Symmetry: D2
């Protein structure tokens, strides 16, 4: 789960670097992601090996019998937690802000799709006249005038369709990335809890080492 979390985030990374010409909150997420996968994720890989190592010793010392060591791996599980949470908290707010922009694009391509349908209707009409048809001369300039009018609004809209398309894609990525990171923070947190909750003395502790070892 740690590892799959890590692996998945690693694979979304390149896909999130692939987008160009997105808003600043999207560039923020791009930068954040890059820092996490480069710096933060190997940190989590390091704590996990130190946790599996600290636990491998103490398991045997517990079985046999039937602290000083904890400290530096408590410290590390707590930074990793903190750091993870705050990077991820920075993604959550950037995601929310793209959501708001998402919507405002929608309302703008209202105007552009409502006005385009006036011109596409006007041109449909001219285009029936042309096809059924002195008459043809009286229609010719108006036709082209209206053709120009639709292509133009059709260009403007297709512009914003591209923006909307891109930002929806992007957001799919960073939401997914957030899903996974969260899974990573739950499990780090979980290992945080147990590095604290460390015959019936050693028996209890041994379950806490085993859970550590499975987590």
């Amino acid at each position: 789960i740690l590892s799959q979390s890590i692996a998945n985030m690693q694979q979304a990374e390149a896909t999130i670097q692939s987008f160009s010409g997105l808003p600043q909150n999207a560039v923020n997420i791009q930068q954040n992601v890059g820092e996490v996968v480069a710096a933060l994720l190997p940190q989590v890989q390091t704590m996990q090996q130190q946790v599996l190592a600290f636990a491998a010793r103490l398991e045997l010392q517990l079985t046999q019998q039937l602290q000083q060591e904890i400290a530096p791996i408590q410290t590390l599980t707590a930074q990793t937690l903190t750091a993870s949470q705050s990077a991820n908290d920075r993604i959550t707010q950037d995601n929310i802000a793209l959501q708001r922009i998402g919507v405002e694009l929608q309302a703008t391509i209202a105007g552009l799709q409502s006005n385009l349908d006036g011109a596409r209707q006007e041109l449909d009409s001219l285009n029936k006249k042309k096809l059924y048809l002195p008459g043809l001369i009286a229609l010719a300039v108006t036709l082209t005038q209206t053709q120009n009018k639709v292509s133009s609004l059709e260009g403007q809209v297709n512009q914003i369709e591209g923006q909307i398309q891109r930002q929806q894609g992007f957001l799919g990525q960073t939401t997914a990335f957030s899903q996974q990171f969260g899974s990573l923070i739950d499990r780090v947190s979980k290992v945080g809890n147990t590095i604290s909750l460390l015959r019936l003395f050693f028996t209890a502790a041994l379950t806490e080492v085993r859970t550590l070892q499975v987590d």
Copy 2:
């Protein structure tokens, strides 16, 4: 298409009129949608009878009527255009309310993540339980509002088909005049 439109617009009204408790903009649509389904659509069904008869009493005399029909076509087209433009604005108002709810589950979900990680002692237990309960409240409202938005969006789009089709009948009536 015109028959297909009207009929699909009938089903989507019945679904839209099943939601209760929704915000300001969501009732605005609920009322608009029954207006269309109850009165405006009959006027589209009507004009079809009359357009198709007009279109039948020329077919004979190829093998005065123009104005009283193009007037009812062009009024139907315009009444529909404004009603659909109205629903459209309310939709983006609901999207905003939507995103705002995403912002609130966000704020709650953190305070929960905090107290819930601290769970894993009746003090913690109640604090989380309230925060759990609360975020299941904001999700319930989110799912329903997406549900509702899905149905008005599907209403609107189907309206626009009927708009295409009505406009097109008018354009032919126009050319024959």
Copy 3:
């Protein structure tokens, strides 16, 4: 969450019943959602009362210091297995609809190809029309035959766009309904479990096991 999921499950029902002319799979869900709201949710509410009441009685007895765990733990198990069953049937019917969903995608891609083939045909005929402006009367009959086929496929596309939209909409609902129901099962199970470990505990070392029993009585109450 017990009570809040139930609300969300209740509000959503009416909406789920409102859909007409949907595939058999949707029709099963509809019927199931009907029975869940009618029969189970009231039985969940009864369980919740009986547990809250049991918990109040044993709470005082503990901060002062089996027969009436039997009835109230079978009820809990019964409520779980019934709920899980209903719910599993909603999972299996949704995936079926997800499959129907993609085949509909395949249909409309088919109706599209054919729709483009027609459009061309008309436009091939309207080439032969530019020639005949050199039996342009003959072509008017074969110009509506095709005008009428292009119209027909557009009508079919349109029919299958509505079907797609309408079904996706319903998946929207029954997925939300299911997400909620899972939250219920989670809570019922938690409740049942705590009512087992209670039994277990309740079955000087006394003052300890009693103060644990209290722990699980207290949580019982927070959880129901």
Copy 4:
């Protein structure tokens, strides 16, 4: 629209080439889009320029090349697109079956995960695996939702380009009908051909 269709198809394709370790239907699309960007789009640029130069101004000699080009550009573009649209449907089928395999896993995980809520470690391992297994199917399903997100967007932009190209290819035909035979019609058709590109 032509340029805006191209530009969007380019941006879409960089993201599409970023996906890695995806099923075959995935890797097919990857290949098929990289082609479309490097092959079909240059020609679409070319033919836009050539129709525009031609549409400001014997002329049966001037249409002949520019008709077949358009008509060739169109037929390749429809083949590319139609093969994206099947890999599309096929990927969605892989997607749905992926939801199905969790629908079976997650059931027996719910079992063990309630059983958790000697003893503790038989429990814990199973839930570890079941949990990992399910969490893996999740990952694939997001990457695929992601991919399909993009090929679908690519495929819609493509559709919009193909349709214009089809519009400009039916005008050139119209125009050559008018010329060979009227000057007025031909004029209204070349003015339609200047608007489209």
